[PDB]
Amino acid sequence: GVGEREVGKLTSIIMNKMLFAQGWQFSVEVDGLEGADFFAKDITYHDYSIEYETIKIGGGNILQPTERSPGQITMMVRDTVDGLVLDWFKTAKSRVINPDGTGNIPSQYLLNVRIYRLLSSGLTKLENEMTVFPVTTGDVTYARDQVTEFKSFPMTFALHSTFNQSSSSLASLLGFSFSL
């Protein structure tokens, strides 16, 4: 009531019930993917780390931030009856790299992934938008012993660049092609 610790706990609980939210308002989505917000189950994001260098000076070392080492996104997802997620991944990696082996233009196979925060009214607001491309889904296991859960897999996407996060629409007269 009037004790210092009671005051502290009262303040804490009031500001907690007034300023705290559980991990409710979130939404992951990708351009060109329908229902992906549903099929995705987990996300792990890292924009980039920044590396420091140490310098010897007397009895002290001084570390200085040097350069943004990129990160990656990894999405854990279950698929549908038709394997539409695997279909999309197949298409994506095909556009990324020619199976003939040549290098594709790094503009046609780049996807704009975005996570928004929901609202109490269902509205969404931007939280993070990356321009990424697929790299690998990892070594995945499939069998019959999965007798209580569905076969699900992660996909790893690498950002195009930690610099100049730019994109454009292919749907135009001047497409993603250029003039040599």
Binding site: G1, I14, M15
Partner: protein
């Protein structure tokens, strides 16, 4: 072909763009409603002597285009609201002199048009002729700039009632004609839309258009005919001279403010210096237990600035919730880059609003409306108005008005948090009236929500309401334990609750606030 772009969107599915515009300024703002406020202003356009809720997206047009400083003394309120809008919306009341008249266009039985002008507040009457009339209420004189109307016909309804379309357009000084809206309507006494909307002429007009109202003779509506007319522009209407402002208009606007059925915790001088109006608003602040933001004439040097406080007449123990402001400097215009002078009242309001709004539970009402976070004027090229004149610290202190000093980065901080409270009691600060007003509010809404309840629980509800509101205050840090434990105890608050009869419950609560540190002492020495 399909590549050429037309001017404006009609009924076709496509894209039409306007010509590129350079002399058009628009700003970004989302209101959060931290401190509802209003003010008495004289502007161009808009309904005078009426409260209008102005947001961060309508002051451009509903309030009208900002005027120039040399156009009388009416740039002060437009600038004031300009800084005020960047925090929260307003409930501004516009006033016009008797010279203001709105234009009216009367259409006869055959649709014959005639023009007239009538003073605002004056009623509208129709003679035997002139079957009906239409008048604009947006406050635009329709001459600078100009607007035109167009009347055409269209298909009929299911009942065969004639339907005619009205289109509105605006024309600038250059002559660029831009449409605004169009609406079809049927003259029938029982006219209905295909979606069931009311097509009755004045009713449909008020339902759709926010700019035009109409009056229709009941004895001539049956015989009223229509015609195709083009370029129907109001003539003869104008606000007149806005420089001349009347105490009658001031008091009428004050009455409107009082009778406004909306919450507002703060009021502004907003470029008003009439002594009677200042006194009226002071009485309003006193009898509504709200905060006032009066300002004095900036041109007053410190010699005559000191007697101006007494000349206000608001000095006393009652008008202590209010504050009085002055700005003895000159700045540079943002828009016209001119050497201009206007009060800092709105800037101070915005500063304290930002300071209070960062706190969550109740707001930092105890926060000093100053500091780098708040005390920032920084309009443009601040220069002193009267470098020759010199203020006096002790005379200024006893005058109880707010002066201003240098800040961190050369900017210019309000170095004062003292109200016009004459007596040197602890309520003569600004945070104390802030807390009294806040607690007055919270007590009001808790009492009103528990109003008219069966007995036996009211005392308990009051007890927990007090506990929870003290919880908010102690979270905010405004109230602390008393500094005197031996005689005054260590309890930051105490409560008394009881009742006299079937009615008249009574409660007395005491609380101890915290410090604000508006003066500091320092002494140097060296050990050599």
């Amino acid at each position: 072909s399909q590549y050429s772009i037309q001017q404006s969107l009609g009924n076709a599915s496509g894209v039409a763009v306007s010509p590129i515009n350079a002399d058009a300024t628009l700003s970004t703002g989302v209101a959060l409603n931290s401190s509802l406020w209003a003010g008495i202003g004289v502007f161009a356009r808009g309904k005078p002597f009426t409260v209008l809720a102005v947001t961060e997206s309508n002051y451009e047009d509903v309030l009208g285009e900002p005027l120039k400083p040399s156009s009388g003394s009416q740039f002060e309120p437009i600038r004031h609201v300009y800084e005020a809008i960047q925090q929260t919306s307003g409930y501004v009341v516009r006033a016009v002199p008797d010279d203001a008249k709105f234009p009216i266009i009367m259409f006869d039985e055959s649709g014959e048009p005639a023009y007239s002008a009538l003073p605002y507040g004056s009623e509208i009457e129709l003679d035997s002729g002139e079957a009906f009339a239409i008048y604009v209420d947006d406050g635009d004189p329709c001459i600078s700039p100009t607007r035109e109307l167009t009347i055409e016909t269209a298909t009929a309804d299911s009942a065969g009632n004639e339907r005619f379309l009205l289109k509105l357009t605006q024309t600038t000084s250059l002559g660029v004609v831009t449409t605004l809206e169009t609406h079809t309507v049927s003259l029938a006494e029982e006219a209905k839309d295909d979606m069931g909307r009311l097509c009755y002429l004045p009713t449909a007009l008020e339902a759709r258009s926010k700019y035009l109202r109409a009056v229709v003779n009941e004895e001539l509506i049956s015989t009223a005919k229509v015609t195709n007319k083009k370029s129907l522009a109001f003539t003869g209407g104008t606000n007149g001279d806005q420089s001349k402002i009347s105490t009658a208009a001031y008091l009428r606007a004050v009455k409107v403010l009082n009778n406004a059925p909306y919450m507002y915790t703060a009021v502004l001088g907003l470029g008003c210096y009439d002594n009677a109006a200042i006194t009226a608003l002071g009485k309003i602040c006193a009898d509504r237990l709200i905060d006032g933001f009066f300002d004095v004439k900036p041109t007053l040097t410190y010699a005559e600035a000191l007697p101006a406080v007494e000349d206000t007449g608001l000095l006393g123990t009652d008008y202590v919730s209010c504050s009085v402001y002055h700005y003895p400097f000159s700045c540079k215009d943002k828009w016209t880059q001119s050497r201009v002078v206007f009060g800092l009242s709105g800037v101070a309001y915005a500063a304290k609003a930002r300071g209070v709004k960062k706190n969550s539970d109740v707001g930092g009402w105890h926060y000093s409306p100053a500091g780098e976070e708040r005390a920032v004027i920084a309009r443009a090229s601040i220069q002193p108005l009267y470098p020759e004149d010199t203020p006096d610290e002790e005379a200024m202190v006893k005058g109880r008005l707010n002066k201003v000093s240098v800040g961190t980065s050369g900017q210019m901080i309000i170095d004062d948090a003292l109200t016009c409270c004459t007596q040197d009691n602890y309520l003569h600060f600004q945070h104390v009236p802030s807390l009294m007003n806040a607690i007055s509010r919270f007590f009001v809404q808790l009492a009103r929500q528990m109003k008219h309840s069966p007995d036996g629980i009211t005392a308990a509800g009051l007890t927990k309401g007090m506990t929870k509101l003290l919880d908010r205050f102690v979270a905010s840090g405004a109230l602390v334990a008393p500094r005197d434990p031996d005689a005054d105890g260590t309890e930051p608050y105490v409560l008394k609750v009881t009742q006299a009869e079937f009615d008249k419950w009574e409660v007395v609560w005491a609380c101890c606030p915290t410090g604000v540190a508006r003066r500091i002492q320092g002494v140097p020495l060296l050990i050599k």
